[PDB]
Write an enzyme that holds these catalytic residues in place. Structure first.
Site, PDB file in Angstrom:
ATOM      1  CG  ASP A  70     -19.301  -9.787 -12.296  1.00 18.15           C
ATOM      2  OD1 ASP A  70     -18.583  -8.950 -12.893  1.00 18.15           O
ATOM      3  OD2 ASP A  70     -18.835 -10.879 -11.866  1.00 18.15           O
ATOM      4  CB  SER A  78     -71.031 -26.752 -13.793  1.00 20.29           C
ATOM      5  OG  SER A  78     -71.943 -26.026 -14.463  1.00 20.29           O
ATOM      6  CG  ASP A 132     -38.774  -5.379 -16.839  1.00 19.01           C
ATOM      7  OD1 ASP A 132     -39.671  -5.672 -15.987  1.00 19.01           O
ATOM      8  OD2 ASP A 132     -37.818  -4.595 -16.610  1.00 19.01           O
TER       9      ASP A 132
END
Ligand SMILES: [Ca+2]
Ligand SMILES: [Ca+2]
Ligand SMILES: [Ca+2]
Ligand SMILES: [Ca+2]
Ligand SMILES: [Ca+2]
Ligand SMILES: [Ca+2]
Ligand SMILES: [Ca+2]
Ligand SMILES: [Ca+2]
Ligand SMILES: [Ca+2]
Ligand SMILES: [Ca+2]
Ligand SMILES: [Zn+2]
Ligand SMILES: [Zn+2]
Length: 616
Positions: free
Chosen positions: A588, A206, A577
């Site tokens: 590869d 707070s 993504d």
């Protein structure tokens, strides 16, 4: 993890978090314990006394009864036991060489006109030999007097507090004004015990958290720059420092948390102020009786509306965010993960579904984590990707689809599918995981779900309409006498296996070890498990499923109608993504997820589409 701090490990960050929360809770000496107990037992139908809001902001002369917040007889002794259990002991004025006063609790007080009610606890952590290793500074902030706060309407008083923080660097300079001399003593004490600034943890809730942020801003700066490298974790602060030093933690429906832009009052300050902030956790919902309530939310969300402040109370910070810390999902989360914490009363818990309502918040992004309680919970996921955690008690889940991980934990737990048994496929790897594939091909991986409930039109059957309860056994879903069989599968061992699918399609479970999964012409589901697995498509529309620390796998024969499903993995940010995770090594494509990897043998990056690389 959501509380990762600076460059500490995930684990080291959590230990810091828990210390921060321990010392923060201690600084309130159980102020909200009476209220929290009543709320837990009874609900929030009575709302919140404006006196607890003034107690939070102003400070108290105690420990007694100003209503309607109950005593609280044992309270400061329980607060002190607890802080000690967490490893901290109050440091004395005498130990510090401090000339000023401490009250009967050992709390220090502010030093300049306007700060004389500001409080701070200074605590030390000692090794098994009695040597100081760490200092904790827990600001309990005020203003303070308990005295401007009754001469106005409560809303006009909150509004003025908020507007007073920004102008003339009041919030920024606050800790230098209030505790400038004390903090010189702490610097002297720390050095005499061989500690440097990295060994000091700064926290508060707070106005306390406003103070954490103020110290960080000054740490440059003052006290010889001794605290420049200290650790700052603020709870429920209205302000954010200008440094990159403070982890700003809070619930998103806490009206005080992030109320200011740095320390600037804006139009959003007195309504929803949920724009993302760099230093802040922006998507942690306290799913409490207020948040759950249509009636309570008839009024606009505002810090000026006292009932909203239920989401501010510290006992729920402690209790809910320690369940994040404890989560089996904890290390999938990051600073802005959408996290729904179950924070309901006993009454409401019995009949309210904990779910992402997305109430008084900007639109949530990425996967959703929902953390239950140690009691019986009702938890509902959306049609996105969801990680549902029941913890102890007898929990019931629902979920609207997507890709999910459902953990029922202790107790007798149930997943209510609320469609027909015929529209789902079930597999079971014999290692405790039961897989549920929905009619849209969304997969949930489940643990500790002993019962599945379906809604049969029906008949199906059988004898039994409408909702029917199936026991989850080694041989299938048992409705008394009938089994609903597990999809065809091949199960390996925890060593290195070669497994071969049948022409019809199989679930292939390598489990642990470096496996060799030879699919066939059918539509297979590949789960290589732990270990570095070689998986070949063999033909068909195939699914490769990656969960947890999946290792360094190789996928051979991946085509356009196949799918990579990443679920419950490292290194993912809200709206990642695959292009974030992809590189090429020769011919590869390599996909990396923290320290795990999938190499798609002879597949060129540019040929990949997001539709067959689900990152959940
Ligand atoms: Ca943020
Ligand atoms: Ca948010
Ligand atoms: Ca539970
Ligand atoms: Ca879902
Ligand atoms: Ca459970
Ligand atoms: Ca194996
Ligand atoms: Ca394996
Ligand atoms: Ca195949
Ligand atoms: Ca294929
Ligand atoms: Ca693997
Ligand atoms: Zn020692
Ligand atoms: Zn092979």
């Amino acid at each position: 993890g959501v509380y990762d701090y600076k460059n500490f490990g995930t684990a080291d960050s959590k230990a810091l978090f828990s210390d921060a929360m321990a010392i923060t809770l201690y600084s309130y000496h159980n102020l909200d314990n009476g209220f929290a107990a009543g709320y837990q037992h009874n609900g929030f139908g009575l709302g919140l006394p404006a006196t607890l809001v003034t107690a939070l902001l102003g400070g108290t002369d105690s420990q007694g009864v100003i209503p309607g917040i109950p005593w609280n007889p044992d309270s400061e002794k329980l607060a002190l036991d607890a802080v000690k259990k967490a490893g901290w002991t109050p440091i004395t004025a005498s130990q510090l060489g401090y000339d000023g006063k401490t009250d009967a609790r050992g709390t220090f007080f502010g030093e300049k006109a306007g700060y004389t009610t500001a409080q701070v606890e200074i605590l030390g952590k000692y090794d098994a030999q009695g040597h100081l290793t760490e200092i904790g500074i827990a600001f309990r902030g005020t203003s303070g007097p308990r005295e401007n706060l009754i001469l106005d309407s409560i809303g006009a008083v909150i509004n003025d507090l908020l507007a007073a923080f920004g102008p003339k660097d009041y919030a920024k300079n606050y800790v230098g004004e209030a505790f400038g001399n004390l903090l010189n003593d702490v610097v002297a004490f720390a050095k005499a015990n061989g500690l440097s600034g990295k060994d000091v943890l700064v926290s508060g809730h707070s106005l306390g958290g406003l103070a954490v942020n103020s110290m960080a801003d000054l740490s440059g700066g003052k006290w010889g720059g001794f605290f420049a490298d200290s650790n700052y974790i603020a709870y429920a602060s209205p302000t954010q420092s200008s440094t990159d030093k403070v982890l700003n933690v809070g619930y998103e429906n806490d009206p005080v948390f992030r109320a200011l832009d740095g320390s600037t009052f804006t139009g959003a300050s007195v309504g929803v102020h949920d724009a993302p902030k760099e230093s802040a956790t922006d998507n942690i919902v306290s799913f409490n009786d207020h948040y759950a309530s249509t009636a309570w939310n008839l009024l606009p969300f505002s810090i000026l509306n006292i009932p909203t402040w239920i989401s501010h109370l510290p006992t729920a910070y402690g209790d809910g965010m320690n369940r994040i810390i404890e989560s089996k999902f904890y290390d999938l989360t990051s600073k802005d993960s959408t996290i729904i914490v179950a924070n309901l009363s006993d009454p409401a818990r019995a009949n309210t579904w904990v779910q992402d309502l997305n109430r008084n918040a900007e639109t949530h992004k990425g996967s959703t984590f929902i953390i239950g309680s140690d009691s019986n919970d009702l938890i509902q996921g959306g049609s996105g990707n969801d990680y549902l955690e029941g913890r102890a008690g007898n929990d019931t889940f629902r979920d609207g689809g997507g890709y999910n991980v459902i953990l029922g934990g202790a107790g007798n737990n149930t997943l209510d599918l609320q469609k027909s048994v015929n529209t789902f496929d079930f597999a079971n790897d014999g290692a405790g995981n039961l897989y549920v594939r929905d009619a849209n091909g969304g997969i949930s991986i489940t643990r500790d779900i002993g019962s599945i409930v379906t809604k049969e039109p029906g008949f199906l059957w059988g004898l039994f309409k409408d909702d029917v309860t199936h026991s989850v056994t080694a041989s299938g879903l048992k409705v008394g006498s009938n089994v609903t069989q597990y999809d065809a599968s091949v199960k390996g061992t925890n060593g290195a296996d070669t497994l071969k699918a049948h022409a019809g399609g199989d679930w292939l479970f390598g489990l642990d070890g470096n496996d060799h999964l030879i699919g066939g012409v059918g539509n297979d589901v590949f789960v290589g498990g732990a270990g570095n697995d070689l998986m070949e498509s063999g033909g068909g529309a195939d699914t490769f499923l990656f969960n947890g620390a999946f290792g360094q796998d190789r996928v051979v024969g991946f085509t356009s109608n196949d799918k990579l499903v990443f679920l419950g993995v490292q290194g993912v940010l809200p709206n990642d993504d695959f292009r974030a995770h992809a590189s090429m090594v020769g011919q590869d494509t390599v996909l990396k997820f923290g320290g795990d990897s999938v190499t798609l043998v002879g597949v060129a990056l540019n040929s990949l589409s997001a539709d067959g690389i689900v990152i959940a």
